[PDB]
Amino acid sequence: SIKVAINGFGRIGRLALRQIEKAHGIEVAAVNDLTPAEMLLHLFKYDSTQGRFQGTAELKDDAIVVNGREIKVFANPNPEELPWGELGVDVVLECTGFFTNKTKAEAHIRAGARKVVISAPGGNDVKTVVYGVNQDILDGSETVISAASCTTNCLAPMAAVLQKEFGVVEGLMTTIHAYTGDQNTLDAPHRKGDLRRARAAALNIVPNSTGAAKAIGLVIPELNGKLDGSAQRVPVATGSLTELVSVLERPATKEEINAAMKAASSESYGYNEDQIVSSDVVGIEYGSLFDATQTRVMTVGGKQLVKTVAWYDNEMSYTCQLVRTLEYFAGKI
Amino acid sequence: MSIKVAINGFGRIGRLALRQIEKAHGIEVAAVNDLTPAEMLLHLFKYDSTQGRFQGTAELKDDAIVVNGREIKVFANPNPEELPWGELGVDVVLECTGFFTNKTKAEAHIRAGARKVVISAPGGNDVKTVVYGVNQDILDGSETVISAASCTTNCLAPMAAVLQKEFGVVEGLMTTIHAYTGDQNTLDAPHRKGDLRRARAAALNIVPNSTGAAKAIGLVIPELNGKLDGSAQRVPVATGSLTELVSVLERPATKEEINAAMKAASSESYGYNEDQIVSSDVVGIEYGSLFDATQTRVMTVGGKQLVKTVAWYDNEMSYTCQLVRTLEYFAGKI
Amino acid sequence: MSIKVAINGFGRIGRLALRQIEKAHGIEVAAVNDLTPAEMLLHLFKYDSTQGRFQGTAELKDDAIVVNGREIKVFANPNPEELPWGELGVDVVLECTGFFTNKTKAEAHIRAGARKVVISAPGGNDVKTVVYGVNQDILDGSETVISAASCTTNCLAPMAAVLQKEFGVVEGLMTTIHAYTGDQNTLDAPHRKGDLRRARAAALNIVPNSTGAAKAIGLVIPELNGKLDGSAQRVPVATGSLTELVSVLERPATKEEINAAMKAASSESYGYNEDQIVSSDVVGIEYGSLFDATQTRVMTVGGKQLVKTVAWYDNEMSYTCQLVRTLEYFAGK
Amino acid sequence: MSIKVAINGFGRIGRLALRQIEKAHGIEVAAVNDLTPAEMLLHLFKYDSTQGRFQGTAELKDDAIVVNGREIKVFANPNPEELPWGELGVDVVLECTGFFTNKTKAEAHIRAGARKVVISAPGGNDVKTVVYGVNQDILDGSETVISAASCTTNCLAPMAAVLQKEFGVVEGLMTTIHAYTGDQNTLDAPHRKGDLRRARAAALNIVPNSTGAAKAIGLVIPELNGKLDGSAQRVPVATGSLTELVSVLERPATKEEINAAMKAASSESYGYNEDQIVSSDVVGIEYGSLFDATQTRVMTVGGKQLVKTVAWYDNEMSYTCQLVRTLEYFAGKI
Ligand SMILES: NC(=O)c1ccc[n+]([C@@H]2O[C@H](COP(=O)([O-])OP(=O)(O)OC[C@H]3O[C@@H](n4cnc5c(N)ncnc54)[C@H](O)[C@@H]3O)[C@@H](O)[C@H]2O)c1
Ligand SMILES: NC(=O)c1ccc[n+]([C@@H]2O[C@H](COP(=O)([O-])OP(=O)(O)OC[C@H]3O[C@@H](n4cnc5c(N)ncnc54)[C@H](O)[C@@H]3O)[C@@H](O)[C@H]2O)c1
Ligand SMILES: NC(=O)c1ccc[n+]([C@@H]2O[C@H](COP(=O)([O-])OP(=O)(O)OC[C@H]3O[C@@H](n4cnc5c(N)ncnc54)[C@H](O)[C@@H]3O)[C@@H](O)[C@H]2O)c1
Ligand SMILES: NC(=O)c1ccc[n+]([C@@H]2O[C@H](COP(=O)([O-])OP(=O)(O)OC[C@H]3O[C@@H](n4cnc5c(N)ncnc54)[C@H](O)[C@@H]3O)[C@@H](O)[C@H]2O)c1
Ligand SMILES: O=C[C@H](O)COP(=O)(O)O
Ligand SMILES: O=C[C@H](O)COP(=O)(O)O
Ligand SMILES: O=C[C@H](O)COP(=O)(O)O
Ligand SMILES: O=C[C@H](O)COP(=O)(O)O
Ligand SMILES: [Cl-]
Ligand code: NA
Ligand code: NA
Ligand code: NA
Ligand code: NA
């Protein structure tokens, strides 16, 4: 069994534990956060958007017992100091939001873990994997990898189909995204100086940057430098979508685009034809859910603008992609 | 000028229209019509969950409300043909119910004795459609029914007009991220218009929905006829919206030149913003559209450019002020 | 033979009742009636913003929905007198429209051929009112129309019944902090029934509103007739509520004694909670009422005691489960 | 001449305090201190998601903001003893950070050279605690550190004082249905203070939580010492709250006697309401407490009565106005 430690027992970290409990041959030996075990256990059991944990979870001294198995709990904010080698940790899921580059994530390796998966973009010098698009770039010799962002896992399969079947000249993305924990509850100073994330999360449409489109070349080299975009955070607590407006290399119709997406569907990339809304993707296990109902092709003379839209639960969709990537990576190491 | 106005549909737009007309010279509201007793209309005029308390005096008088000392008759007749507009001497009806949005239905107010109608929505192809600050000069005063377009059209049109005038537009796709409105259900339930997405709980969901603002832009800007399309995402803010436009232009551009052109085009109708604002910051603004220079993007790949421009609007108050500006301009010509 | 149910009003309660009846053995919904095309009802049944996606299959056919492989007829007649209940062999109608909540109106279903009706709301003076787990034994089977009370009554009654049996209640005042419901407007607008407070935007406001649940408690617990009163505060959660009761008891009490008495009375209808939960944690629960022992207070000042007790309920699913329990018991008698 | 004030903690309360002091004659803010660059503080002062745009001018300068043409110094020192209050001639510090809410910690501002401090929160049992309009007469100006109590105390106290004065209170249990605040998390996450309920997503949940407002009421109304307790239910409105009190009184009472007594006690601090209002209607009000006569209830069973009284408050702006009234009164006691 591959032993996992979760660093940062937050939204992604706790959902990752839920998904890993369902995965054979991989188990979480430890979690680390900033708080006593009682707090972590409570938040694991009870979840405002993802529902009650559907298993048993009990408290023990400096440990939680999940489905009858003990998971040690630590509270050390500095990863290099954690007893990963001493516990026999194979892979750390780095989910704190504070160690999202190679140099910082490698602290887990100095602590004795064999591998790290960052639950976020990790820079250009770590292999970046959207499961179902480019996991074959891993051979197991990597030490630190990235599972990209939630938006990258939504955008990439949609962009891959467009590039493969039509060719992409260029594109601009907008993700309409659930608010997240990096926004304030009420208007207040923001630690990272972001005047827009400073604002009350559940009261506002909040423009904000995202690198998901700009960095797409790490996942789909044929799209390198061809896409850009940004985000609008809105008052849903989870559930998001990505719109892509593209110029393609050949003419296209709505029906041809939709058929190509359906033909590419998989456990990671779903295909939808129902008139759904964001609450309907909460808890889905696709990394991306293409919505054929929103496809649009604007034609003026010989020039076309193409809109394609995919949903994602930025929490659970990304988490399932993260665990698929971890499982594949763990088979290679 | 001196013109007596009646408001048909004392809803979000109708009530804010009264607030703005109370501030406008030469225009007075003589009557409102809705489906409810005067006490309910008075209460909703005084107290407003998003736009704040009415900053004037408002009192109940039998089947009338007294606003800033002046009596406004209240009617509750769902059939506009039966309203006593001729007997009250109404010059212009603001048609704000959502149920009479074409020339034939709005003309019921004329048969009822009013001289003119302004529809607070798109009004069909045989009705002039005016975005104040873009094309009010098409009005000569002889029209009987006009439209002030939609909230989204009033946001989009000044921004698209600048791009067309200064750069030329090949084509473009619009997305408006829009506050939820009264046509969505409070909780998941059957929807009278059959819309499976507006059936869903308004304050819990990102809700895709159609909009005709881009497709119909040619009624306001003829040079853009057939060049734009788009759609909407309704989201859980109770008012306050923005419109994104992704365009192909006829000449190269930088964000700085785009922003400068928008600033040079600014007016009381079309504002220019450089602050890092969010939707709550546009609630209650009186611009029809507020261009956000901080969101402009120009993507260039092999000399081929995609341009994103974004403008905010309070779909309630921005639109209402545009409606009242269009009303004043029209009323000066009748 | 299967007890055949028809649901009149395929709304929040009606659709969740179908979900629960599909899980109930020996009970099946033969038909639903509303004001709506089958395609829209099917869509609302499958996708639910607060209760989640329907777990099962649901497909469209002409004038029917097929749920778990079984056909359910859909009608659209606003006049219950004209519904074909006798022709379908309907045993019990769940009257969930909100418009036919007294004996005279609900009897339209009996003239239409149904044997019995359960109103999903208070039902007026000619109707027995049943909170399952408190007073179902008042039924003798000769009734044609009964009421399963209100959501708040099913929350309050088991808690109040324990206090009365073990301590005696002199008097009490209730406040229910209640999820907003479909009788409030989305944004400020005229309210058809003239309620100046329910006219206001539901998700933006604390909204005081009247409720007769406490004052009418004597219909369920006769010994409390005339002893309780209270009101509601509607707040911006889309489902999930709680009932606070401030009572004067006839004998001295401690927090521990009250909590133990509630636990000793727990059942499938009345749950007992000791965790620090919040409203999202009761979304979808199947208890009619969930006593929250963490909120019990007994204040003693100069030999006089005032007691606060609090129970949670999902006004949607808690009530729906109580309604179905009452339906099963009533149909067995 | 103006009383010179410094604001420590430029948060919800701190920023609204500056707004109110800018409107008050004879009081001015010389400096604010927080943990952030001036550009962030200016932005948050200008734009407010619940209280609206600042109705003045506000511009940035080097380590200063200029508000209505007057420069206000900005510091970013987390240690209050090091602030240059003596050097600026500060008369009163508003301590609004939440981190220095007792006598020993708040006295850091006195050691730093300020003459007086008002803590914007309960400050413990050894500091005088003032609800303006109830007990400001306990101050004679020789104090250095006082407390303006909590938002809930300023709501509860005027209502409870009337009941005690006119009827006598045996005991009572309070529930405040309270807007969520910044001490709750945006989404479920570990909470620094170990509160399993404030850990949960603020805008998705009814959140039970403790409050000391009723238990400490004796600091404000000594005759009620030990007679009240209560708790809070935090709910998804971003500001605007109400307090329910269920009381056992020393003599029989009717709804009319209670309501008439509240109206007779009304003032700039304690409002009297008879309209069917909801929480959004009290956002930005300047009363410390707004009694709601429509919610009064007296239940009688035999000779035993239970009395329910309810008052609204904007936990932000109502309390801020009380804080500034207390500041003004205290600074005048020379
Ligand atoms: N939430 C989403 O939609 C989402 C989607 C994809 C990726 N991500 C990424 O996942 C990461 C986590 O995001 P989240 O939403 O789970 O945030 P979160 O704030 O819910 O979780 C972060 C957790 O890390 C803990 N933590 C912080 N610093 C720590 C330290 N030094 N040592 C140990 N624990 C520490 C916090 O206590 C918290 O529990 C970020 O990189 C984020 O960008 C988030
Ligand atoms: N809300 C916005 O963002 C917005 C912006 C621009 C335009 N509009 C347009 O303005 C119109 C009104 O929208 P709203 O948001 O004010 O809706 P609303 O539902 O708040 O107001 C409509 C009012 O009309 C009344 N009404 C309905 N039928 C009536 C009849 N037959 N006779 C009299 N009164 C009747 C209703 O009682 C209600 O008070 C619609 O056409 C809408 O498209 C709305
Ligand atoms: N939602 C709750 O929390 C809750 C809890 C307990 C009881 N109730 C009660 O249950 C009833 C329904 O409440 P809801 O929240 O489900 O309301 P809802 O508005 O969601 O559903 C009512 C349904 O009845 C339909 N309908 C209306 N008139 C009809 C007619 N003449 N014939 C057939 N169908 C018709 C509507 O189209 C709608 O689908 C009410 O009596 C309510 O008080 C609701
Ligand atoms: N918000 C309310 O409803 C309300 C009502 C009454 C009283 N209060 C009380 O007022 C205080 C502030 O509450 P708030 O809601 O404004 O909180 P807030 O978090 O919005 O503001 C506190 C500010 O203090 C700053 N700060 C923190 N530590 C600091 C330090 N060491 N030095 C300088 N600045 C520091 C923070 O950056 C923040 O800007 C608390 O005591 C609170 O209990 C709040
Ligand atoms: O603390 C919150 C996390 O950083 C989540 O924010 P993100 O998913 O936007 O990076
Ligand atoms: O009832 C609500 C009105 O019809 C507003 O809806 P709309 O502005 O989306 O048309
Ligand atoms: O649609 C509205 C119904 O009457 C449900 O609301 P209620 O449960 O508050 O009666
Ligand atoms: O961080 C925010 C404030 O400390 C809120 O504190 P409060 O909830 O006690 O007002
Ligand atoms: Cl004195
Ligand atoms: Na496992
Ligand atoms: Na006027
Ligand atoms: Na069944
Ligand atoms: Na001043």
| CB nearest to A170's CB, from B170, B208, B301 | B301
| CB nearest to B308's CB, from A172, A205, A278 | A172
Q: Is the dihedral of CA A255, A257, A263, A268 positive or negative?
A: negative
* Helices C12-23 and C317-332: angle between axes, nearest 10 degrees: 60
Q: Strand, coil or helix: what is A229?
A: strand
Work out the minimum CA distance from D196 to partner chain A, whole angstroms.
Answer: 7
Instruction: Supply C276's token pair.
Output: 């620090």
Tell me the CA–centroid distance for residue A190 and ligand 8, in Å.
16
Q: Strand, coil or helix: what is D164?
A: helix
Could you tell me which residues are beta bridge partners of residue A207?
Answer: A232
Instruction: Supply D12's token pair.
Output: 């919800």
Q: What is the chain B residue with the closest CA to D48?
A: B281
Partner chains of B (3+ C-beta pairs under 8 Å): A, C, D
Looking at chain B, list the stretches that DSSP marks H as alpha helix, in order from N- to C-terminal side. 12-21, 38-46, 85-88, 103-106, 108-111, 151-166, 255-264, 317-333
Q: What is the chain C residue with the closest CA to D224?
A: C301
Q: What whole-number distance in Å separates Cα of residue C239 and Cα of residue C203?
A: 11
Residues in D closer than 8 angstroms to A9, CB to CB, are: 190
Q: Does the C-beta of B106 come closer than 6 Å to ligand 2?
A: no
Q: Which residue's alpha carbon is nearest to atom 10 within ligand 7? A: C183
Contacts 24+ apart (CB under 8 A), A213-218: A213/A155, A213/A171, A213/A172, A213/A173, A213/A244, A215/A121, A215/A124, A215/A128, A215/A148, A215/A152, A216/A152, A216/A155, A216/A156, A216/A159, A218/A124, A218/A127, A218/A128, A218/A148
Could you tell me which residues are beta bridge partners of residue D273?
Answer: D292
- Which residues touch B3 (CB under 8 Å, ≥6 apart)? B26, B27, B28, B91, B92, B331, B334
Work out the minimum CA distance from D46 to partner chain B, whole angstroms.
Answer: 9
Q: What whole-number distance in Å separates Cα of residue D25 and Cα of residue D3?
A: 9
Tell me if C154 sits within 8 A of C289, measured CB to CB. yes
Q: What whole-number distance in Å separates Cα of residue C47 and Cα of residue C58?
A: 10
β-strand pairing of B116-119 with B145-147: parallel
Instruction: Supply D197's token pair.
Output: 């309920």
Residue with tokens 């909470």, as numbered in its chain: D191
Tell me if A276 sits within 8 A of A311, measured CB to CB. yes
Q: What whole-number distance in Å separates Cα of residue C244 and Cα of residue C307?
A: 10
Q: Does the C-beta of D210 come closer than 6 Å to ligand 8?
A: no
Tell me if D83 sits within 8 A of D111, measured CB to CB. no
Q: Does the C-beta of B141 come closer than 6 Å to ligand 2?
A: no
Tell me if A116 sits within 8 A of A92, measured CB to CB. yes
Q: Which of B254, B267, B248 is nearest to B321 (CA)?
A: B267
Q: What's the Rg (C-alpha) of chain D?
A: 20
Q: What whole-number distance in Å separates Cα of residue B210 and Cα of residue B233?
A: 8
Instruction: Supply A135's token pair.
Output: 């996991």
| CB nearest to B196's CB, from C10, C43, C199 | C43
Of B188, B245, B276, B300, which to mutate for an interface test with A (greatest number of A Cβ within 10 Å)? B276
Work out the minimum CA distance from D43 to partner chain C, whole angstroms.
Answer: 25
Contact C50 A279 (CB under 8 A): yes
Of A186, A191, A206, which to mutate for an interface test with D (greatest number of D Cβ within 10 Å)? A186
Q: What whole-number distance in Å separates Cα of residue A135 and Cα of residue A146?
A: 11
Looking at chain A, list the stretches that DSSP marks H as alpha helix, in order from N- to C-terminal side. 11-21, 37-45, 84-87, 102-105, 107-110, 150-165, 254-263, 316-332
Residues in C closer than 8 angstroms to D308, CB to CB, are: 173
Work out the minimum CA distance from A51 to partner chain C, whole angstroms.
Answer: 7
β-strand pairing of B116-119 with B92-95: parallel
Cα→Cα distances A69→A5, A58, A72, A86, Å: 14, 10, 10, 19
Residues in C closer than 8 angstroms to A282, CB to CB, are: 52
Instruction: Supply D245's token pair.
Output: 């009190």
- Which residues touch B121 (CB under 8 Å, ≥6 apart)? B98, B101, B147, B148, B149, B150
Q: Which of D255, D266, D242 is nearest to D162 (CA)?
A: D266
Q: Which of A257, A211, A249, A203 is nearest to A231 (CA)?
A: A211
Q: Which residue's alpha carbon is nearest to atom 9 within ligand 8? A: D183
Give DSSP secondary structure letters for B213-281.
Answer: TTTTGGGT-GGGTTTEEEEEEEES-SS-EEEEEEEEESS---HHHHHHHHHHT--SSEEEE-S---GGG
Phi-psi region of B70 (alpha: psi -120 to 50; beta: other; left: phi over 0): beta
Tell me if A321 sits within 8 A of A291, measured CB to CB. no
Q: What whole-number distance in Å separates Cα of residue A107 and Cα of residue D119?
A: 43
Contact C190 B50 (CB under 8 A): no
Could you tell me which residues are beta bridge partners of residue D229?
Answer: D173
Backbone φ and ψ for D55, nearest 5 degrees, come out as: -95, 50
Tell me the CA–centroid distance for residue B30 and ligand 8, in Å.
48
Q: Which of A130, A235, A124, A103 is nearest to A179 (CA)?
A: A235
Of C48, C281, C282, which to mutate for an interface test with A (greatest number of A Cβ within 10 Å)? C281
Q: Which residues of C141-154 are buried (b: 16+ CB within 10 A; e: fewer)?
A: eebebbbbbbbbbb
Work out the minimum CA distance from B204 to partner chain C, whole angstroms.
Answer: 7
Q: What's the Rg (C-alpha) of chain A?
A: 20
Ligand whose nearest atom lies closest to the CA of A100: 1
Could you tell me which residues are beta bridge partners of residue A168?
Answer: A248
Instruction: Detail the residues of D annotated as belonging to a binding site.
Output: 12-13, 34, 78, 120, 150-152, 181, 211-212, 234, 315
Cα→Cα distances D304→C163, C252, D163, D168, D256, Å: 18, 16, 17, 15, 18
C43 has a chain A CB within 8 A of its CB = yes
Give DSSP secondary structure letters for D274-324.
Answer: -S---GGGGTT---SEEEEGGG-EEEEETTEEEEEEEEEE-TTHHHHHHHH
Q: Counting beta carbons within 10 angstroms of the beta carbon of residue D35, is it exposed (0 to 12), middle (13 to 18) or buried (19 or more)?
A: middle
Q: What is the resolution of this structure in A?
A: 1.9
Q: What whole-number distance in Å separates Cα of residue C226 and Cα of residue C245?
A: 15
Contact B306 A207 (CB under 8 A): no
Q: Does the C-beta of C102 come closer than 6 Å to ligand 3?
A: no
Q: What is the chain D residue with the closest CA to B240?
A: D49
Q: Which of D332, D328, D327, D286 is nearest to D120 (CA)?
A: D327
Ligand whose nearest atom lies closest to the CA of B27: 11
Q: What is the chain C residue with the closest CA to A239?
A: C49
Could you tell me which residues are beta bridge partners of residue A330?
Answer: none
Q: What's the Rg (C-alpha) of chain C?
A: 20
- Which residues touch A263 (CB under 8 Å, ≥6 apart)? none
Q: DSSP letter for A200, please.
A: B
Cα→Cα distances D221→C269, D102, D123, D159, D253, Å: 44, 20, 16, 11, 21
Cα→Cα distances B92→A211, B1, B8, Å: 52, 13, 10
Tell me the CA–centroid distance for residue D157 and ligand 12, in Å.
55
Quote the Cα angle for B223-B227-B231, to 5°: 125
Q: Strand, coil or helix: what is B124?
A: coil
Q: Does the C-beta of D183 come closer than 6 Å to ligand 8?
A: yes
Q: What whole-number distance in Å separates Cα of residue D313 and Cα of residue D309?
A: 14
Ligand whose nearest atom lies closest to the CA of B189: 3
Q: Counting beta carbons within 10 angstroms of the beta carbon of residue A112, is it exposed (0 to 12), middle (13 to 18) or buried (19 or more)?
A: middle
Q: Does the C-beta of D232 come closer than 6 Å to ligand 4?
A: no
Tell me if D76 sits within 8 A of D69, measured CB to CB. no
H, E, C per residue of chain C? CCEEEEEECCCHHHHHHHHHHHHCCCEEEEEEECCCCHHHHHHHHHCCCCCCCCCCCEEEECCEEEECCEEEEEECCCCHHHCCHHHHCCCEEEECCCCCCCHHHHCHHHHCCCCEEEECCCCCCCCEECCCCCCHHHCCCCCCEEECCCHHHHHHHHHHHHHHHHCCEEEEEEEEEEECCCCCCCCCCCCCCCCCCCCCCHHHCCEEEECCCCCCHHHCCHHHCCCEEEEEEEECCCCCEEEEEEEEECCCCCHHHHHHHHHHCCCCCEEEECCCCCHHHHCCCCCCEEEEHHHCEEEEECCEEEEEEEEEECCCHHHHHHHHHHHHHHHHC
Q: Does the C-beta of B102 come closer than 6 Å to ligand 6?
A: no
Q: What is the CB neighbour count within 10 angstroms for residue C7?
A: 26
Residues in B closer than 8 angstroms to C34, CB to CB, are: 190
Tell me if C119 sits within 8 A of C103, measured CB to CB. no
Q: What is the CB neighbour count within 10 angstroms for residue B194?
A: 12
Contact A277 C47 (CB under 8 A): yes
Backbone φ and ψ for C112, nearest 5 degrees, come out as: -75, -10
Residues 236-265 of B with CB under 8 A from C: 236, 238-239
Q: Which atom of ligand 6 is nearest to the CA of B98?
A: 4
- B151 part of the active site: yes
Q: Does the C-beta of A77 come closer than 6 Å to ligand 5?
A: no
Cα→Cα distances D145→D92, D95, D102, D222, Å: 9, 10, 9, 20
Q: What whole-number distance in Å separates Cα of residue D60 and Cα of residue D267?
A: 38
Q: Does the C-beta of A34 come closer than 6 Å to ligand 1?
A: yes
Q: What is the CB neighbour count within 10 angstroms for residue C101?
A: 18
Tell me the CA–centroid distance for residue C121 and ligand 3, in Å.
9
Tell me if C327 sits within 8 A of C27, measured CB to CB. yes
Work out the minimum CA distance from C232 to partner chain D, whole angstroms.
Answer: 10
Residues in A closer than 8 angstroms to D34, CB to CB, are: 189
| CB nearest to D281's CB, from B53, B278, B280 | B53
Q: Strand, coil or helix: what is D63?
A: coil
- Which residues touch B50 (CB under 8 Å, ≥6 apart)? B238, B239, B283, B316, C187, C188, C201, C204, D280
Instruction: Supply B132's token pair.
Output: 């104040």
Backbone φ and ψ for B111, nearest 5 degrees, come out as: -60, -30
Q: Which domains does chain A have, with CATH numbers?
A: 3-148+315-332 (no CATH), 149-314 (3.30.360.10)
Q: Amino acid identity, residue B303?
A: G
Ligand 5 pocket test: pick from A33, A35, A94, A180 the residue with the most ligand atoms within 8 Å of its Cβ. A180
Residues 176-205 of A with CB under 8 A from B: 176, 195-196, 199-200, 202-205
Of C39, C187, C237, which to mutate for an interface test with B (greatest number of B Cβ within 10 Å)? C187
Q: What is the CB neighbour count within 10 angstroms for residue A52?
A: 16
Contact D275 B49 (CB under 8 A): no
Tell me if B131 sits within 8 A of B215, measured CB to CB. no
Q: Amino acid identity, residue C135?
A: N
Q: What whole-number distance in Å separates Cα of residue C112 and Cα of residue D50?
A: 54
